[PDB]
């Protein structure tokens, strides 16, 4: 009965579509409208259930450890495998480089995963002791736990941001300096903006094009388009030696 989950190729289709829609929003110059009505673009029914609320870049040794906003934890290891620990303290899911998923438990698991389990526990403990939870102000909706828990598909960092791409399609961009964050959902064609005051607001992209938005959000969306391009192909299709 279990769903196989949205497959990565299907995620890539929606990503390309979001790339195109970001281009369209951005080319519409949304901060230049006669009267910007950003509030009218809000779409509360499309609020994301999941985002990365904490992260640790130990990629020099092991990988990128993270917490999701339901307090589950995961790691994308340097061998492109993922281990996630659900918020019950014991349930695990292991995802191989090719996406093959297996379910296990901390109490009952193949011995082959002992090392990666122990590393995940170290990441968890670190995050819990040291790091602030992003979106700690959002109270979950009833049944949000029924949505498929995603894993971190890919990530990268620039000088100004970290880019986190989840297996449900979402692309999260966290800006280092000012703590502002974007959560782009290519399935809902929506974007959530977390501003410097920690206000969390979810917009329909097509409505940002219709109604406009402030220049800070407009600026972050220009950068987002560039990040999506990089995600889709780290190297340019017009010159594969050149970084997207």
């Amino acid at each position: 009965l279990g769903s196989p989950g949205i497959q990565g190729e299907v995620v890539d289709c929606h990503l390309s579509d979001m790339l195109q829609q970001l281009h369209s929003v951005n080319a519409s110059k949304p901060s230049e409208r006669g009267l910007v009505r950003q509030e009218e673009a809000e779409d509360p029914a499309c609020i994301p259930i999941f985002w990365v609320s904490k992260w640790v870049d130990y990629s020099d040794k092991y990988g990128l450890g993270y917490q999701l906003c339901d307090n589950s934890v995961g790691v994308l290891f340097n061998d492109s495998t993922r281990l996630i620990l659900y918020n019950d303290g014991d349930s695990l899911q292991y995802i191989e480089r090719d996406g093959t998923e297996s379910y296990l438990t901390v109490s009952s698991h193949p011995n082959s995963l002992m090392k990666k389990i122990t590393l995940l526990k170290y990441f968890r403990n670190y995050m819990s002791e040291h790091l602030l939870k992003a979106g700690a102000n959002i109270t979950p909706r009833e049944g949000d736990e029924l949505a498929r828990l995603p894993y971190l598909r890919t990530w990268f960092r620039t000088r100004s941001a970290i880019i986190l791409h989840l297996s449900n399609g979402s692309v999260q961009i966290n800006f280092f300096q000012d703590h502002t964050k974007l959560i782009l959902c290519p399935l809902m064609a929506a974007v959530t903006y977390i501003d410097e005051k920690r206000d969390f607001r979810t917009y329909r992209l097509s409505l940002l094009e219709e109604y406009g938005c402030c220049k800070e959000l407009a600026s972050r969306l220009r950068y987002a388009r560039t990040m999506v391009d990089k995600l889709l192909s780290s190297r340019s299709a017009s010159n594969r030696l050149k970084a997207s």
Binding site: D57, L131, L132, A134
Partner: peptide, 8 residues
């Protein structure tokens, strides 16, 4: 660049 998300 920072090696973690925002600290407590």
């Amino acid at each position: 660049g920072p090696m973690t998300s925002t600290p407590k």
